[PDB]
From Swiss-Prot:
UniProt superkingdom: Eukaryota
Cysteines joined through disulfide linkages: none
Function: Inhibits signal transduction by increasing the GTPase activity of G protein alpha subunits thereby driving them into their inactive GDP-bound form. Binds to G(i) alpha-1, G(i) alpha-2, G(i) alpha-3 and G(q) alpha.
GO molecular function: GTPase activator activity; GTPase activity
CC terms in the record's Gene Ontology section: cytoplasm; plasma membrane
Phylogenetic classification of the source organism: Eukaryota, Metazoa, Chordata, Craniata, Vertebrata
Compartmental location: Cytoplasm
UniProt entry keywords in alphabetical sequence: Cytoplasm, Phosphoprotein, Signal transduction inhibitor
Tissue: Expressed in peripheral leukocytes, bone marrow, platelet, spleen and fetal liver.
Protein name: Regulator of G-protein signaling 18
Domain RGS: 14-130
Species of origin: Homo sapiens (Human)
Claim: Cytoplasm is one of the keywords in the record: yes
Length: 134
């Protein structure tokens, strides 16, 4: 999508700016698809959708869904969330708060950074946005 090199270099400092920019989100998800790591980004995105809820009982229903389907070490998805964190969650899932998975959000978010975002910055994709030199 329409992005200028300036916007691109700004994506190289502000991860949220990359995400919030429709063009950036597009580029990042398409790249992230090659390694199927989109699971992680959409994981805590789903946690924000959970955080968007306002139904107390629904909080438990949603949290239980996210629990068995994502939070678990096995799960049909199996999220790359930190062990110690998901351990505390598997226990704290009895009475989840609106931001119960705020820890999970923080973990996975900065995990994609140090893992996927680094290679993203040195990928031919981002270097193409730079048009500098191979």
């Amino acid at each position: 999508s329409m992005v200028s090199p300036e916007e691109a270099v700004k994506w190289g400092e502000s991860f949220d700016k990359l995400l919030s920019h429709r063009d950036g989100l597009e580029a990042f998800t398409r790249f992230l698809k090659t390694e199927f790591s989109e699971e992680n980004i959409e994981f805590w995105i789903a946690c924000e959708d959970f955080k968007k809820s306002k139904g107390p009982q629904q909080i438990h229903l949603k949290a239980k869904a996210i629990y068995e389907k994502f939070i678990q070490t096995d799960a049909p998805k199996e999220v790359n969330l930190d062990f110690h964190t998901k351990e505390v969650i598997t226990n704290s899932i009895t009475q989840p708060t609106l931001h119960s998975f705020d820890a999970a959000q923080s973990r996975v978010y900065q995990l994609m950074e140090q893992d996927s975002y680094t290679r993203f910055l040195k990928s031919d994709i981002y270097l193409d946005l730079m048009e500098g030199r191979p």
